[PDB]
Design an enzyme around this catalytic site. Structure first.
Site, PDB file in Angstrom:
ATOM      1  N   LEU A  92      13.585 -11.960  17.801  1.00  0.00           N
ATOM      2  CA  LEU A  92      12.196 -11.935  17.348  1.00  0.00           C
ATOM      3  C   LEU A  92      11.397 -13.095  17.928  1.00  0.00           C
ATOM      4  O   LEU A  92      10.217 -12.938  18.262  1.00  0.00           O
ATOM      5  CB  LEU A  92      12.137 -11.962  15.822  1.00  0.00           C
ATOM      6  N   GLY A 140      -3.808  -2.660   1.189  1.00  0.00           N
ATOM      7  CA  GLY A 140      -3.387  -3.091   2.507  1.00  0.00           C
ATOM      8  C   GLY A 140      -4.361  -4.012   3.208  1.00  0.00           C
ATOM      9  O   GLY A 140      -4.010  -4.573   4.251  1.00  0.00           O
ATOM     10  N   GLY A 168       0.794  -1.210   0.000  1.00  0.00           N
ATOM     11  CA  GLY A 168       0.000   0.000   0.000  1.00  0.00           C
ATOM     12  C   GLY A 168       0.832   1.269   0.000  1.00  0.00           C
ATOM     13  O   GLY A 168       2.055   1.263   0.146  1.00  0.00           O
ATOM     14  N   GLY A 182      -7.028   0.869   3.473  1.00  0.00           N
ATOM     15  CA  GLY A 182      -7.004   0.815   2.029  1.00  0.00           C
ATOM     16  C   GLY A 182      -7.136  -0.593   1.480  1.00  0.00           C
ATOM     17  O   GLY A 182      -6.854  -1.577   2.158  1.00  0.00           O
ATOM     18  N   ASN A 205       5.828   9.231  10.080  1.00  0.00           N
ATOM     19  CA  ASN A 205       6.610   8.077   9.651  1.00  0.00           C
ATOM     20  C   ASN A 205       7.997   8.063  10.279  1.00  0.00           C
ATOM     21  O   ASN A 205       8.613   6.997  10.384  1.00  0.00           O
ATOM     22  CB  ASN A 205       6.704   8.052   8.129  1.00  0.00           C
ATOM     23  N   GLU A 220      12.030 -14.353  20.777  1.00  0.00           N
ATOM     24  CA  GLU A 220      12.034 -14.192  22.228  1.00  0.00           C
ATOM     25  C   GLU A 220      10.788 -13.459  22.721  1.00  0.00           C
ATOM     26  O   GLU A 220      10.005 -14.008  23.505  1.00  0.00           O
ATOM     27  CB  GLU A 220      13.299 -13.455  22.663  1.00  0.00           C
ATOM     28  N   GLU A 226     -14.032   2.337   5.251  1.00  0.00           N
ATOM     29  CA  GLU A 226     -12.922   1.792   6.030  1.00  0.00           C
ATOM     30  C   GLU A 226     -13.331   0.894   7.206  1.00  0.00           C
ATOM     31  O   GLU A 226     -12.517   0.029   7.571  1.00  0.00           O
ATOM     32  CB  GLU A 226     -11.971   2.916   6.483  1.00  0.00           C
ATOM     33  N   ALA A 249       0.651   3.717   2.233  1.00  0.00           N
ATOM     34  CA  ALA A 249       1.160   3.975   3.576  1.00  0.00           C
ATOM     35  C   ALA A 249       2.404   3.148   3.868  1.00  0.00           C
ATOM     36  O   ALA A 249       3.355   3.642   4.485  1.00  0.00           O
ATOM     37  CB  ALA A 249       0.077   3.690   4.613  1.00  0.00           C
TER      38      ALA A 249
HETATM   39  N1  LIG Z   1      -0.722   5.887  10.262  1.00  0.00           N
HETATM   40  C1  LIG Z   1      -0.683   6.250   8.984  1.00  0.00           C
HETATM   41  N2  LIG Z   1      -1.677   5.836   8.124  1.00  0.00           N
HETATM   42  C2  LIG Z   1      -1.649   6.197   6.820  1.00  0.00           C
HETATM   43  C3  LIG Z   1      -0.621   6.989   6.332  1.00  0.00           C
HETATM   44  N3  LIG Z   1      -0.844   7.191   5.015  1.00  0.00           N
HETATM   45  C4  LIG Z   1      -1.980   6.548   4.662  1.00  0.00           C
HETATM   46  N4  LIG Z   1      -2.495   5.935   5.774  1.00  0.00           N
HETATM   47  C5  LIG Z   1      -3.715   5.112   5.847  1.00  0.00           C
HETATM   48  O1  LIG Z   1      -4.026   4.574   4.575  1.00  0.00           O
HETATM   49  C6  LIG Z   1      -5.424   4.551   4.383  1.00  0.00           C
HETATM   50  C7  LIG Z   1      -5.777   4.700   2.907  1.00  0.00           C
HETATM   51  O2  LIG Z   1      -4.959   3.891   2.087  1.00  0.00           O
HETATM   52  P1  LIG Z   1      -3.728   4.554   1.285  1.00  0.00           P
HETATM   53  O3  LIG Z   1      -2.490   4.567   2.147  1.00  0.00           O
HETATM   54  O4  LIG Z   1      -4.092   5.951   0.848  1.00  0.00           O
HETATM   55  O5  LIG Z   1      -3.469   3.626  -0.005  1.00  0.00           O
HETATM   56  P2  LIG Z   1      -3.818   2.057  -0.027  1.00  0.00           P
HETATM   57  O6  LIG Z   1      -3.623   1.441   1.337  1.00  0.00           O
HETATM   58  O7  LIG Z   1      -2.929   1.383  -1.042  1.00  0.00           O
HETATM   59  O8  LIG Z   1      -5.355   1.950  -0.495  1.00  0.00           O
HETATM   60  P3  LIG Z   1      -5.832   2.302  -1.992  1.00  0.00           P
HETATM   61  O9  LIG Z   1      -5.561   3.758  -2.280  1.00  0.00           O
HETATM   62  O10 LIG Z   1      -7.309   2.022  -2.125  1.00  0.00           O
HETATM   63  O11 LIG Z   1      -5.069   1.439  -2.968  1.00  0.00           O
HETATM   64  C8  LIG Z   1      -5.972   5.693   5.222  1.00  0.00           C
HETATM   65  O12 LIG Z   1      -7.170   5.311   5.856  1.00  0.00           O
HETATM   66  C9  LIG Z   1      -4.904   5.966   6.260  1.00  0.00           C
HETATM   67  O13 LIG Z   1      -5.362   5.586   7.535  1.00  0.00           O
HETATM   68  C10 LIG Z   1       0.385   7.411   7.192  1.00  0.00           C
HETATM   69  O14 LIG Z   1       1.302   8.115   6.772  1.00  0.00           O
HETATM   70  N5  LIG Z   1       0.349   7.039   8.519  1.00  0.00           N
END
Ligand SMILES: Nc1nc2c(ncn2[C@@H]2O[C@H](COP(=O)(O)OP(=O)(O)OP(=O)(O)O)[C@@H](O)[C@H]2O)c(=O)[nH]1
Ligand SMILES: Nc1nc2c(ncn2[C@@H]2O[C@H](COP(=O)(O)OP(=O)(O)O)[C@@H](O)[C@H]2O)c(=O)[nH]1
Ligand SMILES: Nc1nc2c(ncn2[C@@H]2O[C@H](COP(=O)(O)OP(=O)(O)O)[C@@H](O)[C@H]2O)c(=O)[nH]1
Ligand SMILES: [Mg+2]
Lengths: 426, 431, 111, 426
Positions: B244, B138, B10, B135, B220, B246, B175, B12
């Site tokens: 790991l 993910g 993903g 997402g 991040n 442990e 979500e 993120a």
């Molecule tokens: N904690 C955290 N969560 C993030 C961050 N960036 C994105 N997210 C999470 O990612 C979710 C959305 O997915 P994205 O990261 O935009 O992309 P994706 O997971 O590939 O999903 P799709 O765009 O549908 O392909 C959001 O609900 C956020 O909670 C980040 O920098 N930190």
């Protein structure tokens, strides 16, 4: 990679697209000759989404024009940005409709459909992976609405698993510039509801409302109106061309915008609109976007969502910003106004962030909102249709050209079922 | 002799991975070309005969807009180009699209490339997987990846970093729909799994770090420092080390419970670090404060049954055991009656390093706490109510049904999750 | 059943007005800085191995495209490029000192 | 080494062959005097295929011209390249046919054939290893059809182990300029079907609409029409004169498109031709050449392949390219158009690549295809012949010169079972 094929229907769609192709060519740095003239390396890698490749490094748009009157084609071709399109993309008919829905759907619709289908297939087969299409048309005339419905009601069966966007110019009560416009509006929406992924409702009254109240333009001609329409129709699909911290494609907006397949009529909105006098006084800050954008005046639809409930909410932002304030302001305006939001979807808001700013601005915002306030506009079109049809208004133009009287009744029965369907969520 | 493979899914996971690998190269002294300007990098960097080092991480995505900046930026030459798997059409926040329709086209490529990386490693220590509950990539693609990985690799530890959806704010509307059908997959296909709420880091960076306007890069950086303390014992010797295998054994009492809460301390700016003395007894107090968790739940409502400690830097074991004793004397914190000694301690010598332009400051001793708590049933009961009110009149179900999965999987996940909520309720009852 | 003698002419003034309105390219040969394909030449067919000059402008643009953002832009453009932008060490990297800086060192019996 | 003796018949043949020899001489770099003026050495490597060496470094074409009226070769010798031709090869009679197949085949043409055979024998012997002959003629008039068909039968018994091309210009239902041309076409094809190896079908209807819609010209004189067919005339024999990766001469093509001895009719086509307004906007690559090759508007015959099945197809490319995408484009169009190809032979494509393109261009292709659609030209002229013959009309010009009435019945019987055999593969 992901490509969008552009459609233009009617004189309204042609003039909207002509200004729209001027806006994003300046956004991507394209002169009227066609040469790329850019100052950044970021403007070139995502060009194939809307342009082709030609000999000598030229780019031609992926657009096709549909019209039944060449009196607008010569003005389109002689415009400042009319030399870029390929001449084969222009499609013109010799017999027009005459603001009649019947002419473009039944009799003269069958002859012009073969040429427009031939050119769209020849340019869509060059895509390595087609993402979707895009349409612009008006409901106030049968040239762009009679054809625009039949082309959609054909190319869905050809390409079922694709995404289809259209911008519909809904007719207006005070911009009532056609006697037969209820007939054009109602019998097109009946076809529009069952066979379209995405629809946008833009109104000329609300376009007049911004230029008189916000922009303070003395003579807001149709070039300024298409400037406002292209401002939100370019910013809705920025993520296809420009990367950001949180990208969101139009498919990603769509799957969260419609909870049901028939709830696909939205209310677009654009935040950074300020007159020349107030531009110096106003500041560009993240709460300034959501304050102006959630202002009920700034909509381009002729119905206020204060009477209704915010069903689902989306916002697409532009520019470099810290976005803690973005999540802070959306939660603030969601919790402060707890009566305008539906109870059975918590967290009604979609959010997208694009790093690359619009040209000449630090920041912007684009809004897409679904609500039950659209049932106002549908029932106001329906009451004027049933006020005319019970004395059988203009029957000889419609019945004698090759359809039965029951097509009107089933269209009204479907549209009555639309209004009752939208009522239960209020 | 010890090797770990990183898996990032993903957008993120990619952005977290770029921030993590920036920290990793600066920690080990690696130029962005890939060559140094003595063998601690063998767990993360593969060795080339010319002197270059290639990371053991696979970046995957289904949208090219995220991977493109990786292939363009400063580290364009450092990463192997076959490690950055890019799809064509993303699932677009749909679990069903990422599981049943799109994910099977690239599941051959990512499972082939993970075999080439596992071939080079003589002894595998663990797979680190970064993923997001929200997402589609993910959630959907990650779900059947472990289902294939559970039968491809038998007992190899697969440690997990979840991005738990926020309780009050949101990126997406669907979500909660995505963050439930993955819990079924992660019960029987995940060894350990940490979680995070976004606004908790937002509260920490706003209040502690004096940053009134942060970005995802600033989050991040704090996530990457949490990651580095786990692998610090793998890459640097200490008075007593932790592996790991442990800490994964001492924190799960049952296979259905593998969801602890991490907490980093001290988090402080370079201005306040000049003021405050940071002793080990003073940094261990910040791991128990209800305002300083990275998780948006208060452990005062629940009770502890397993705790893990990761001390790094100039630390003395006497003051560690003295500070552990005085926390046990405090009656605000509660432990279960069936686990009297719930502590596990890890010690590392090297102080944590910081990147230029970062948020934190150079520190001489730091602590990471891994505590299992009954209070994650608090956040799940909040989210369970949000799911079934959405599902009461079948919202957004037409999108997931039309992809290819049957309609019974939604109620299948609900009757599963209701049993796990009942499971945590009867763990916390006293004997 | 249209009138062919009129279809011919309404093509003729259409082509004529296209000729009147047509404006040619201003001879600005612009190419993408992305990858362009070559057809590799015959080893032995002598018409595929002549002597020809090569453009140095595309060499300069290639050597400027294969580059990092720090030495492309004086100020960064997007938020993704914030990671790794400033890479200098604030204190010199005295990694040779085993006193303050502890590392894993392999032994002769594991190797 | 391997050489072709060109043969030129009829008034239409003299017009089309003059443009043909202007194309070849321009391709090989020959001035209007005769001396080689070029920049490359390779143009002299294969020059004996169409040219005979003379003294003083001069080159003359090995083409024979036969005509019945001296007024056409006066225009040929007054043309731009009329002084290149040898004056001995001009063969003429004192009285023309007057669009009469009977007089050109039985009464008048039986005297000039003694001189024509003597001229072609003194040029077919002067060589070393003869590849084949080519005829260029039209079926609309008796000068090039009555003389040509008898000339074919005389050469076949002299040189049986050769290959013989003919570019016959078939009559058309719309550009019908001769009343008795169904009689001329039917009696010619009866003698042509059994005594040749390759036939090309050229129609003026297909030459018109290409110059009209595809090419966008205003004055389509016969020079432009002859220029169009000379491109396919020169492109088929590119492997003979120029080196390439996959050389394919006439007999290598002939053994592939002719599965049965009575199936030797082809659909010519040219790929890289386009309008002067859209020369710029288009890009020149093998997806564009393959896409432009297979549409119904590019065929040089008045038939639609969508009404039939492509039996065998071929394509000879010109210019430097890469061959992986050459076969991939052919593989994609083979897979996607599964209904238009016969199933008893897969891999219907024949591929030839030549390294050297024509001047003024860097990339070109030529299409030769055997399809099932050519029978609609055959039955159109069959019913017109049957309607005219059932009233016993226009027979006093034919049966008074030595023809009995059973020859038309035998020609019709040979015409009917030809299309009856040809029907069985649809
Ligand atoms: N904690 C955290 N969560 C993030 C961050 N960036 C994105 N997210 C999470 O990612 C979710 C959305 O997915 P994205 O990261 O935009 O992309 P994706 O997971 O590939 O999903 P799709 O765009 O549908 O392909 C959001 O609900 C956020 O909670 C980040 O920098 N930190
Ligand atoms: N929003 C918008 N509306 C327009 C524009 N031009 C015309 N209209 C409206 O469209 C109506 C006429 O549309 P018409 O030209 O007949 O559409 P057509 O029949 O498809 O060509 C008028 O009532 C106008 O109010 C425009 O540029 N923008
Ligand atoms: N393609 C083409 N066709 C031609 C040309 N000149 C004449 N024709 C066609 O030939 C037909 C007349 O043929 P004709 O000269 O009587 O044949 P002949 O009696 O054998 O010489 C006309 O209908 C024209 O359409 C030419 O230069 N090119
Ligand atoms: Mg994503």
């Amino acid at each position: 990679m992901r490509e969008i094929v552009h459609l233009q229907a009617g004189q309204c769609g042609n003039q909207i697209g002509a200004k729209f192709w001027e806006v994003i060519s300046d956004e991507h740095g394209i002169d009227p000759t066609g040469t790329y003239h850019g100052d950044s390396d970021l403007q070139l890698e995502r060009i194939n989404v809307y342009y082709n490749e030609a000999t000598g490094g030229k780019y031609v748009p992926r657009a096709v024009l549909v019209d039944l009157e060449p009196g607008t084609m010569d003005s389109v071709r002689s415009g400042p940005f009319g030399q870029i399109f390929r001449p084969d993309n222009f499609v013109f008919g010799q017999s027009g409709a005459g603001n009649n829905w019947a002419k473009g759907h039944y009799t003269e619709g069958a002859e012009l459909v073969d040429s427009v289908l031939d050119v769209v297939r020849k340019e869509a087969e060059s895509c390595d992976c087609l993402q979707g299409f895009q349409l612009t048309h008006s409901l106030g005339g049968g040239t762009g609405s009679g054809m625009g419905t039949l082309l959609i009601s054909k190319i869905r069966e050809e390409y079922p698993d694709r995404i289809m966007n259209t911008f519909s110019v809904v007719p207006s009560p005070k911009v009532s510039d056609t006697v037969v416009e209820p007939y054009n509006a109602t019998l097109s929406v009946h076809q529009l509801v069952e066979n379209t992924d995405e629809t946008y409702c833009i109104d000329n009254e609300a376009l007049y409302d911004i230029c008189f109240r916000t922009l303070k333009l003395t003579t807001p001609t149709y070039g300024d109106l298409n400037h406002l329409v292209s401002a939100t129709m370019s910013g809705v699909t920025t993520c296809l061309r420009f990367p950001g911290q949180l990208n969101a494609d139009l498919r990603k907006l769509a799957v969260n915008m419609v909870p049901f397949p028939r709830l696909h009529f939205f209310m677009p909105g654009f935040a950074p609109l300020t007159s020349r006098g107030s531009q110096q006084y106003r500041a560009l800050t993240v709460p300034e976007l959501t304050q102006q954008m959630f202002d009920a005046k700034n909509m381009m639809a002729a119905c206020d969502p204060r009477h209704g409930r915010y069903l689902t909410v989306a916002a697409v932002f532009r520019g470099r910003m810290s976005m803690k304030e973005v999540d802070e302001q959306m939660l603030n305006v969601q919790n402060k106004n707890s009566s305008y939001f539906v109870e059975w979807i918590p967290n009604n808001v979609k959010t997208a962030v694009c790093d690359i700013p619009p040209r000449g601005l630090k920041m912007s915002a684009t809004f897409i909102g679904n609500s039950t306030a659209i049932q106002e506009l549908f029932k106001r079109i329906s009451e004027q249709f049933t006020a005319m049809f019970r004395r059988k208004a203009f029957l000889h133009w419609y019945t004698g050209e090759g359809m039965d009287e029951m097509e009107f009744t089933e269209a009204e029965s479907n549209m009555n079922d639309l209004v009752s369907e939208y009522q239960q969520y209020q | 002799m010890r090797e770990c493979i990183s898996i990032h899914v993903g957008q993120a996971g990619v952005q977290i991975g770029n921030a993590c690998w920036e920290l990793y190269c600066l920690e080990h002294g690696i130029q962005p070309d890939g060559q140094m300007p003595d063998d601690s990098f063998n767990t993360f960097f593969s060795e080339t005969g010319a002197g270059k080092h290639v990371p053991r991480a696979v970046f995957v995505d289904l949208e090219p807009t995220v991977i493109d900046e990786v292939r363009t930026g400063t580290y364009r030459q450092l990463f192997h180009p076959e490690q950055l798997i890019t799809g064509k059409e993303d699932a677009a926040n749909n679990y069903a699209r990422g599981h049943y329709t799109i994910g099977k086209e690239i599941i051959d490529l990512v499972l082939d490339r993970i075999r080439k990386l596992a071939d080079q490693c003589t002894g595998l220590q663990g797979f680190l997987v970064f993923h997001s509950f929200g997402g589609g990539t993910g959630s959907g693609f990650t779900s059947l990846l472990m289902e294939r990985l559970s039968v491809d690799y038998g007992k190899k530890s697969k440690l997990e970093f979840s991005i738990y959806p926020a309780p009050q704010v949101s990126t997406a509307v669907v979500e909660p729909y995505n963050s439930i059908l993955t819990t079924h997959t992660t019960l029987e296909h995940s060894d350990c799994a940490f979680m995070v709420d976004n606004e908790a880091i937002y509260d920490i960076c706003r209040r502690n770090l004096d940053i009134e306007r942060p970005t995802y890069t600033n989050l991040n950086r704090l996530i990457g420092q949490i990651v580095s303390s786990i692998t610090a014992s793998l890459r640097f010797d200490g008075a007593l080390n932790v592996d790991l295998t442990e800490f994964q054994t001492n924190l799960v009492p049952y296979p259905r419970i593998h969801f602890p809460l991490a907490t980093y301390a001290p988090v402080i700016s370079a201005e306040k670090a000049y003021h405050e003395q940071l002793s080990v007894a003073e940094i261990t107090n910040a791991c128990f404060e209800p305002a300083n968790q990275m998780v948006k739940c208060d452990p005062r409502h629940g009770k502890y049954m397993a705790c893990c400690l990761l001390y790094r830097g100039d630390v003395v074991p006497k003051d560690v055991n003295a500070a552990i004793a005085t926390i046990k004397t405090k009656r605000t914190i509660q432990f279960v009656d069936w686990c009297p000694t719930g502590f596990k301690v890890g010690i590392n010598y090297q102080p944590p390093t910081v990147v230029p332009g970062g948020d934190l400051a150079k520190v001489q001793r730091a602590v990471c706490m891994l505590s299992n708590t009954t209070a994650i049933a608090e956040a799940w009961a909040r989210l369970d109510h949000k799911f079934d009110l959405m599902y009461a009149k079948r919202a957004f179900v037409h999108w997931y049904v039309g992809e290819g999965m049957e309609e019974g999987e939604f109620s299948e996940a609900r009757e599963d999750m209701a049993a796990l909520e009942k499971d945590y309720e009867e763990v916390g009852v006293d004997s | 059943i249209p009138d062919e003698v009129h279809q011919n002419q309404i093509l003729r003034e259409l082509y004529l007005k296209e000729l009147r309105t047509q404006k040619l390219y201003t001879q600005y040969h612009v190419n993408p800085l992305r990858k362009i394909h070559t057809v590799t030449r015959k080893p032995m067919s002598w018409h595929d191995n002549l002597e020809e000059p090569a453009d140095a402008r595309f060499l300069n643009l290639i050597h400027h495209a294969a580059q990092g953002p720090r030495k492309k832009y004086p100020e960064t453009q997007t938020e993704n490029q914030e990671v790794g932008w400033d890479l200098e060490p604030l204190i010199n990297p005295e990694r040779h000192d085993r006193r303050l800086n502890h590392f894993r060192v392999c032994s002769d019996i594991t190797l």
